Design a protein around this ligand. Sequence first.
Ligand SMILES: Nc1nc2c(ncn2[C@@H]2O[C@H](COP(=O)(O)OP(=O)(O)OP(=O)(O)O)[C@@H](O)[C@H]2O)c(=O)[nH]1
Ligand SMILES: CN[C@@H]1CCc2c(ccc(O)c2O)[C@H]1O
Lengths: 232, 281, 54, 333
Amino acid sequence: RNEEKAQREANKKIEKQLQKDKQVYRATHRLLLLGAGESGKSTIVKQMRIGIFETKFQVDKVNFHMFDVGGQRDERRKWIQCFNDVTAIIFVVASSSYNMVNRLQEALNLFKSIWNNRWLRTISVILFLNKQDLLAEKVLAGKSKIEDYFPEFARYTTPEDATPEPGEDPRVTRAKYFIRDEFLRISTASGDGRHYCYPHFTCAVDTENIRRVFNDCRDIIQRMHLRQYELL
Amino acid sequence: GMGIVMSLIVLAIVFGNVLVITAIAKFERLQTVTNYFITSLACADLVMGLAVVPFGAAHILTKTWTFGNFWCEFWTSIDVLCVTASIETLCVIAVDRYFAITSPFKYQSLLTKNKARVIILMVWIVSGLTSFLPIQMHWYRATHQEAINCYAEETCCDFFTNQAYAIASSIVSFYVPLVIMVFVYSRVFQEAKRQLQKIDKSEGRFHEHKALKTLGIIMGTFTLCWLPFFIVNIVHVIQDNLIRKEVYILLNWIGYVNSGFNPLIYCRSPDFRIAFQELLC
Amino acid sequence: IAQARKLVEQLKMEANIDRIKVSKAAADLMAYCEAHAKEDPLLTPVPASENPFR
Amino acid sequence: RQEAEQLKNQIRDARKACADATLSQITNNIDPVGRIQMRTRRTLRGHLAKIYAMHWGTDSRLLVSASQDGKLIIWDSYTTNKVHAIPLRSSWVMTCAYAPSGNYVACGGLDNICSIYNLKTREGNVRVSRELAGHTGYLSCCRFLDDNQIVTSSGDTTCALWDIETGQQTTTFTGHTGDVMSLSLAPDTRLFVSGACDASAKLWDVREGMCRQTFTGHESDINAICFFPNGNAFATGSDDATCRLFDLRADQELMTYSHDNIICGITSVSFSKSGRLLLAGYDDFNCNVWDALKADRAGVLAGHDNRVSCLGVTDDGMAVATGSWDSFLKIWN
Ligand SMILES: Nc1nc2c(ncn2[C@@H]2O[C@H](COP(=O)(O)OP(=O)(O)OP(=O)(O)O)[C@@H](O)[C@H]2O)c(=O)[nH]1
Ligand SMILES: CN[C@@H]1CCc2c(ccc(O)c2O)[C@H]1O
């Protein structure tokens, strides 16, 4: 008789703690860090800090939780279904490896595979085009040319909307925007309006890489709510 | 003909409201913080359609109130209570949509089920304090010959108020929520424009009517349903004999019709359509 | 070259086994199911008195 | 190297010679089971996120579940009362197990380790007892052989047998090409089967540590595997909307369970106590009940609003439990 009452005492205590954990669970944002390889993930992680690996960082009193899967190294990814309900995916690609063995085409294929997945159908991607200075150096130098490895670069021309930084050569910005549009075309072709892509030009000396993620996540949540309320 | 139209209005209101309420109750994927306000709004409209409209229709068609003065006072009180509690919930829905967009990071902490319940009971208490309290205590009665005579007559059921109540109740019921709704929806429109401008700048070449087609519908139906009556309410007390008694009732019934449109406006999401396909057919 | 030898050795250890006809195996499965069909609460519903979840 | 082709040809020829009839050709006059209708009896709530794993107890009263929020709750089916709630060091959890004696619970996931928790011993609050490491890939399943030994499968294309007292791999199993996704133990715990992502299922020997037979009939990765109560057959389910029954003694397929109106994957399979019903969970938000000996549907279980990822049947065959991505569990009868 008293056994039934004894169990309900433990149920009430357990249900009290589950309420505290729900507050924390819904007030934090989960981010997945993904990279092609030899791209600079460790350096990108190091600047924000200042099996599996998790890092904690808080900006403007908002808690973020980033995951870097490195224990599982394979060409097939069946663990990717676990990340159905993340806020965003951070994709890091080395922009200067357009000639060394092609690594850039492999990164494009990986991005296309990720975008068209059956489970990642409502997840946006934050794109970090790393190693900008190496690209600038090997483009200014005449040692190698892009059109030898990407034939479409010959007919490509810079758009009028492009705004290069001061002091930049036209060839460097043409190369940068061509590489960016190569990803943007894949992003736009199959998108149904439920997820976008936010490309950024980063470097080793950049220090504002922790504000870009904050702004992009804010935009993602705002757009999701707007689309939900039939206003976008 | 008039009886047929009135019965059709009653049936439509009751059917829509009951369907929405039972669809929310039966399933578990439709039980969120937002849907609680919709449940409260659906309640008032059902109570309005179930109670107020049939007796007003009978009084209009028979041209004679066949109940005591107590029932007439009770009917007026429940009329004001249902009208007040229905408009003020739309303001709550608008404010929730405002907070969900302008401050997305803090939205989860800002609103919780307990806070939603507290807000709903606060709205209903404020609505009840302005309808039963001033009417049952006879603080709203007029003081001219026709009003006194028709109060004395047992067969009357007519509306006669002084200036103070006709101004205060109208302000509380209509004019305060209107400013809030206007400000909220203007800010939401600005946010939508900003996002649309960002998207076009980022990836425009590879490729605001959407927001207008929604906001205009939402604001226009409410304004066109409830504004003329709440203007003539002030007008006919400010100066006498300007407003005929046959237009007051017509505008009031035009306002009553709005109870049958809310389920269409606020329950068109795919989840509601799927739920309706299950319960029906 | 050892991997090929390891695979070849394994294939030789799975081909020299004693197999039975499919008819007998299917008959055995059918006989087991028919014998134990009486004690199956899901197949044959139990009375509400013996049901602990009702 | 070409000797393998001749060797495989001999296997196919012998397997073709044995099959002189069909399971459908002899179970043709058996009366059908009719229509089976099941209604939900209990609904358990409390998980903040989706659920991957679930395992019944040998007492047919208690069960454990795992969720992506990082908790491990032990329920009481009869009274719907939570008994325990173990927070996990790593949020990403993929499997759980419940010991036959009821004194331990296992866990594992993307951290490449397996954790053992102590419940009924001198622990007012459940605390970690051991941590087993050595896999280079994520864990997929784990089953208790005894109170001191456990068998696990991983994405390393390998399975291992562990010793909890010392914490080292006593025996390792190799031979798969793709990731191992599930395993099941025989009633006598002498042999077990595993299903990999290379569309092949293998039969292992626990004591010897060597493979015995290989079955290949699927067109895609095998996600679930279950073992017949007799001990002489097993059933698998892949993401090509097919379930297949294999026989150990005959060394070949017997029957396939598929319909033209279903095109989704399969996440779990399970038998009943007698073995006449096969219960399979799908990606179409629902579950299907099959006739083992006739390949005819007998019912359907509906009520989940997301993927069905877990499925189990009690030892006495009294109830069926299903877990889903909707963060709810249901009991059917
Ligand atoms: N010049 C330059 N070098 C960089 C930059 N980012 C990374 N590197 C160098 O590239 C090398 C490889 O990058 P890591 O930081 O190790 O990143 P990673 O660990 O190789 O990334 P994964 O291989 O994908 O794991 C490092 O030695 C860095 O010094 C950059 O922005 N500019
Ligand atoms: C008789 N009909 C009444 C008259 C006055 C009135 C109504 C509704 C809300 C108010 O705040 C009012 O003052 C109408 O429903």
